[PDB]
Design an enzyme around this catalytic site. Structure first.
Site, PDB file in Angstrom:
ATOM      1  N   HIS A  41       0.818  -1.205   0.000  1.00 21.15           N
ATOM      2  CA  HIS A  41       0.000   0.000   0.000  1.00 21.15           C
ATOM      3  C   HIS A  41       0.853   1.256   0.000  1.00 21.15           C
ATOM      4  O   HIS A  41       0.356   2.325  -0.357  1.00 21.15           O
ATOM      5  CB  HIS A  41      -0.935  -0.028   1.212  1.00 21.15           C
ATOM      6  CG  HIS A  41      -2.116   0.884   1.099  1.00 21.15           C
ATOM      7  ND1 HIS A  41      -3.145   0.649   0.212  1.00 21.15           N
ATOM      8  CD2 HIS A  41      -2.470   1.985   1.804  1.00 21.15           C
ATOM      9  CE1 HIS A  41      -4.069   1.583   0.359  1.00 21.15           C
ATOM     10  NE2 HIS A  41      -3.683   2.406   1.317  1.00 21.15           N
ATOM     11  N   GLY A 143      -0.273   5.175  11.131  1.00 18.00           N
ATOM     12  CA  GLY A 143       1.162   5.057  10.982  1.00 18.00           C
ATOM     13  C   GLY A 143       1.733   3.729  11.418  1.00 18.00           C
ATOM     14  O   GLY A 143       2.946   3.528  11.293  1.00 18.00           O
ATOM     15  N   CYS A 145       1.127   0.766  10.130  1.00 14.28           N
ATOM     16  CA  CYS A 145       1.188  -0.230   9.079  1.00 14.28           C
ATOM     17  C   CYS A 145       2.620  -0.720   8.900  1.00 14.28           C
ATOM     18  O   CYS A 145       3.576   0.056   8.954  1.00 14.28           O
ATOM     19  CB  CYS A 145       0.654   0.386   7.782  1.00 14.28           C
ATOM     20  SG  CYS A 145      -1.072   0.876   7.988  1.00 14.28           S
TER      21      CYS A 145
HETATM   22  C1  LIG Z   1      -7.929   5.197  16.263  1.00 17.04           C
HETATM   23  O1  LIG Z   1      -7.140   4.950  15.134  1.00 17.04           O
HETATM   24  C2  LIG Z   1      -7.840   4.555  13.988  1.00 17.04           C
HETATM   25  C3  LIG Z   1      -6.786   4.252  12.908  1.00 17.04           C
HETATM   26  O2  LIG Z   1      -5.994   3.193  13.367  1.00 17.04           O
HETATM   27  C4  LIG Z   1      -5.326   2.412  12.415  1.00 17.04           C
HETATM   28  C5  LIG Z   1      -4.894   1.132  12.757  1.00 17.04           C
HETATM   29  N1  LIG Z   1      -4.257   0.368  11.896  1.00 17.04           N
HETATM   30  C6  LIG Z   1      -4.030   0.791  10.650  1.00 17.04           C
HETATM   31  C7  LIG Z   1      -4.415   2.057  10.238  1.00 17.04           C
HETATM   32  N2  LIG Z   1      -4.151   2.536   8.873  1.00 17.04           N
HETATM   33  C8  LIG Z   1      -3.177   3.418   8.674  1.00 17.04           C
HETATM   34  O3  LIG Z   1      -2.416   3.850   9.734  1.00 17.04           O
HETATM   35  N3  LIG Z   1      -2.883   3.887   7.466  1.00 17.04           N
HETATM   36  C9  LIG Z   1      -3.621   3.467   6.477  1.00 17.04           C
HETATM   37  N4  LIG Z   1      -3.312   3.985   5.166  1.00 17.04           N
HETATM   38  C10 LIG Z   1      -2.217   4.939   5.001  1.00 17.04           C
HETATM   39  C11 LIG Z   1      -2.409   6.330   4.961  1.00 17.04           C
HETATM   40  C12 LIG Z   1      -1.281   7.169   4.777  1.00 17.04           C
HETATM   41  C13 LIG Z   1      -1.074   8.605   4.692  1.00 17.04           C
HETATM   42  N5  LIG Z   1       0.216   8.815   4.524  1.00 17.04           N
HETATM   43  C14 LIG Z   1       0.857  10.120   4.382  1.00 17.04           C
HETATM   44  N6  LIG Z   1       0.867   7.659   4.490  1.00 17.04           N
HETATM   45  C15 LIG Z   1      -0.010   6.645   4.641  1.00 17.04           C
HETATM   46  C16 LIG Z   1       0.183   5.255   4.675  1.00 17.04           C
HETATM   47  C17 LIG Z   1      -0.921   4.434   4.863  1.00 17.04           C
HETATM   48 CL1  LIG Z   1      -0.669   2.693   4.914  1.00 17.04          CL
HETATM   49  N7  LIG Z   1      -4.599   2.573   6.656  1.00 17.04           N
HETATM   50  C18 LIG Z   1      -5.416   2.103   5.528  1.00 17.04           C
HETATM   51  C19 LIG Z   1      -4.756   0.958   4.740  1.00 17.04           C
HETATM   52  C20 LIG Z   1      -3.458   0.560   5.022  1.00 17.04           C
HETATM   53  C21 LIG Z   1      -2.866  -0.479   4.321  1.00 17.04           C
HETATM   54  C22 LIG Z   1      -1.439  -0.889   4.646  1.00 17.04           C
HETATM   55  N8  LIG Z   1      -0.377  -1.200   4.898  1.00 17.04           N
HETATM   56  C23 LIG Z   1      -3.567  -1.141   3.315  1.00 17.04           C
HETATM   57  C24 LIG Z   1      -4.874  -0.747   3.028  1.00 17.04           C
HETATM   58  C25 LIG Z   1      -5.465   0.295   3.741  1.00 17.04           C
HETATM   59  C26 LIG Z   1      -6.902   0.719   3.420  1.00 17.04           C
HETATM   60  C27 LIG Z   1      -4.867   2.120   7.869  1.00 17.04           C
HETATM   61  O4  LIG Z   1      -5.877   1.216   8.091  1.00 17.04           O
HETATM   62  C28 LIG Z   1      -5.086   2.891  11.115  1.00 17.04           C
END
Ligand code: A1EGR
Ligand code: A1EGR
EC number: 3.4.19.12
Lengths: 301, 301
Positions: A41, A143, A145
């Protein structure tokens, strides 16, 4: 004495965490020998994340589009490829801190340690179990991931999980280190839902044995039951059916406590039918199912 | 999202654990710069352990009576001294893995990570809180003496606990790294009993805020209360009295959730008076008191 949710010491894994950035998209990677593993991703821009075609996005990248940082040291990317939902970035330096390791896929009901990381920096460590519906109930913020889950056996780190996303119910989905998702999930921003879950019966019984070893005995009884009448009650309470292999695996704990497995099942049936009446077991007021028989033996022997 | 009992990454501490042996008595030590810290009980033979005079036992030892092993490398002891209940063994090599560190003493209600070790080898990591009666509810087996508790802030390890013994109730007693016991305990084999304990109210409220941040809201209500009527109920349930400083420390969580502190106290009063009615909060069926406001902020922000 005592019983805690205990993780493996995290140092061997801390030495492998790095930051991977592609454009303005960034996340954590795992640096082993001269390869950095991370969720694919990362090659998505904001507009790509909803419905990405990853093959198209990857062919449009070159090595210099990937900035990998290990501490303050930038690692030079000399190759890139995609393996299912993981990206493999070949770098020009082998990680001097690489432990002995294996990539293993785990089963529902098995536990592992999670090293939560942000910007390539480890922040915390905790124990997780893989649920029947192939999610984990983790603790992850934006963050996180690319954070990994692992077990340790004789200095060998078996990596089993790399974190990808949070589902709408607040539980977590990810892949093995070969990039293959646990469960029917995809790395795209779709509202995806975890399937139904069940309670991991063999783990609950293992935890009851842990309780006995540690001196909680109040739930014991002279009753016994058969496997099939127990399972008739388990089904009614959404518990996984107990099998003869489960009974077998509980053999050692049964021996060390002198409580036959089907006796402890009689205890569990009573607990499911009557609750705990304001009483606790190992400091908990519900039946805990995220300790395996192996976990119990490790802490109580 | 999610909320777990999360420990600090343990690598910085793993690099300092060693084994210390005096005669046939052995336990864990902590190697920082050219000094190894360990419980003084190691200088006791089996017959000395019941009622030892440690000054007498120490004056009868020389450096070569202490075998210190870091991995397979034996460290040469070049000096020894006693500091309260800790022994300081000067060795001829400074630990190359020494992190930045501090020796700090903590307060009841504060949390820390414990790296459980056996024969100088780390086995697991978990979170503990120092109770009001100066015990901790740890997970320790025979051979765990000398394991340490710590917090980490910006690469600085603040060591706060070294493990000495298990009391008859199965809870744990130890010292700060200056060798001074937490609580009214002595390193002798006497049946010593932990004093009465209380529930850490500010921590329970912090955890309720964690629950709200993570979407558990069912226990909220339009009621409010005063600090003194709350404390009148707390006293009845063996909860620490809430102070204005506690209310102050909960300010940030109150702001980020928009639930005033005394509103959440009204919620807690209802929970103490009516229980949870088969419902859970952050996966628990009792009120959890081993998360500090700082712990909550770290995981939920
Ligand atoms: C109370 O908190 C609620 C949020 O908690 C979380 C817990 N776990 C994970 C997340 N999370 C994240 O952090 N980022 C996140 N996308 C991102 C957004 C970003 C923005 N920039 C500048 N860079 C980024 C990098 C990523 Cl990857 N995605 C979505 C996602 C990630 C991957 C991967 N690999 C694959 C598919 C999807 C749809 C996510 O689901 C959030
Ligand atoms: C289900 O398990 C129940 C036991 O769990 C435990 C959990 N925590 C700690 C222990 N524990 C131990 O391991 N050893 C232990 N004395 C020892 C016995 C030993 C035998 N040899 C060969 N070498 C030894 C070293 C130690 Cl030190 N003492 C008692 C103790 C230790 C110290 C110190 N410092 C100071 C005072 C006392 C009285 C203890 O209390 C046990």
């Amino acid at each position: 004495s005592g019983f805690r949710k205990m993780a493996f010491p995290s140092g061997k894994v801390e030495g492998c965490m790095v930051q991977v950035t592609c454009g303005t998209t960034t996340l954590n990677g795992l640096w082993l020998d001269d390869v950095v593993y991370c969720p694919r991703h990362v090659i998505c821009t904001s507009e790509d994340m909803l419905n990405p075609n990853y093959e198209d996005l990857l062919i449009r990248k070159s090595n210099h589009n990937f900035l990998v940082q290990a501490g303050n040291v930038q690692l030079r990317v000399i190759g890139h490829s995609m393996q299912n939902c993981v990206l493999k970035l070949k770098v020009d330096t082998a990680n001097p801190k690489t432990p002995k390791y294996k990539f293993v896929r785990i089963q529902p009901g098995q536990t592992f340690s999670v090293l939560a990381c942000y910007n390539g920096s480890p922040s915390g460590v905790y124990q997780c179990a893989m649920r029947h519906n192939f999610t984990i109930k983790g603790s992850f913020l934006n963050g996180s991931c690319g954070s990994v889950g692992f077990n340790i056996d004789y200095d060998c780190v078996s990596f089993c999980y790399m974190h990808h996303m949070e589902l709408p119910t607040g539980v977590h989905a990810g892949t093995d280190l070969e990039g293959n998702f646990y469960g029917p999930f995809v790395d795209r921003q779709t509202a995806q839902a975890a399937g139904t879950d069940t309670t991991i019966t063999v783990n609950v019984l293992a935890w009851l044995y842990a309780a006995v070893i540690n001196g909680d005995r109040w739930f014991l009884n002279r009753f016994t039951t058969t496997l099939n009448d127990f399972n008739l009650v388990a089904m009614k309470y959404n518990y996984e059916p107990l099998t003869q292999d489960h009974v077998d695996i509980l053999g050692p704990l049964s021996a060390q406590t002198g409580i036959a497995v089907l006796d402890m099942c009689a205890s569990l049936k009573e607990l499911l039918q009557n609750g705990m009446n304001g009483r606790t077991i190992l400091g908990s007021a519900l039946l805990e199912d995220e300790f395996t028989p192996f976990d119990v033996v490790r802490q109580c022997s």
